Design a protein around this ligand. Structure first.
Ligand SMILES: [Mg+2]
Ligand SMILES: [Mg+2]
Ligand SMILES: [Mg+2]
Ligand SMILES: [Mg+2]
Ligand SMILES: [Mg+2]
Ligand SMILES: [Mg+2]
Ligand SMILES: [Mg+2]
Length: 157
RNA sequence: GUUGGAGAGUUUGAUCCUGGCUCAGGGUGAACGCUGGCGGCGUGCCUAAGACAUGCAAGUCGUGCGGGCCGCGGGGUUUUACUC
């Protein structure tokens, strides 16, 4: 039981003696809009055999999300490849402003409001796990003063 | 109320990066085409600081002052001219 959007598909080429041969690849999201969200990337001989497979990888590739009033806890930036991904919390009423692919992934993960830009290289797939990582790395006003300080926690609080 | 930030297309049998050209967004003192019922409020030589006919666009005070003129009313003479 997981709602699951789909990001992008492509046909890629191998080669051989006498004509080409192929394979297709399917970028897939997942996510209970309250918290969680996965991604997959699936290759297979005939198309929706892949689109189906890509759904698989996403179930294991899950990322719980710190979510806070439908928005992002602090600001944030991450590189991965030469594709540079930006997030930043928006207020109630500003909502999934983000190009093509963060929208797909942020929405389904459950964001109401957010701000966003994409950078340099724009290839989907990088900006895909650009942001899978951007989100693996969100940190919370409590996860946090119990990363630091928490040396001696429960004397503080 | 940190009030605020969407990208894609295209080099290759295909893939990753660089990189240019390109399109989507809003903007006008606008013009051009097909079309054109109205009203309010704006607004209208961006080009030749090229050349301009005709009319108007800076005058007002008779309580600063002396007369022209064209009359009008009243006076010195019995009537004229002329004069106040
Ligand atoms: Mg780099
Ligand atoms: Mg680039
Ligand atoms: Mg080609
Ligand atoms: Mg804009
Ligand atoms: Mg226009
Ligand atoms: Mg006409
Ligand atoms: Mg002029």
């Amino acid at each position: 039981d997981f709602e699951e959007k789909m990001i992008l598909i492509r046909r890629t080429a191998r080669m051989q003696a006498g004509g080409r041969r192929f394979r297709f690849g399917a970028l897939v999201v997942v996510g209970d809009r309250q918290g969680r969200v996965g991604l997959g990337f699936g290759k297979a001989p005939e198309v929706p055999l892949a689109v189906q497979k890509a759904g698989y990888y996403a179930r294991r590739n899950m990322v719980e999300v710190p979510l806070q009033n439908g928005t992002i806890p602090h600001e944030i930036e991450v590189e991965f490849g030469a594709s540079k991904i930006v997030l930043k919390p928006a207020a109630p009423g500003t909502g999934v402003i983000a190009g093509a692919v963060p929208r797909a992934i942020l929405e389904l993960a459950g964001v109401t409001d957010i701000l966003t830009k994409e950078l340099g290289s724009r290839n989907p797939i990088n900006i895909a796990y650009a942001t899978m990582e951007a989100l693996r790395q969100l940190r919370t006003k409590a996860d946090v003063e119990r990363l630091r300080k928490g040396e001696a926690h429960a004397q503080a609080q």
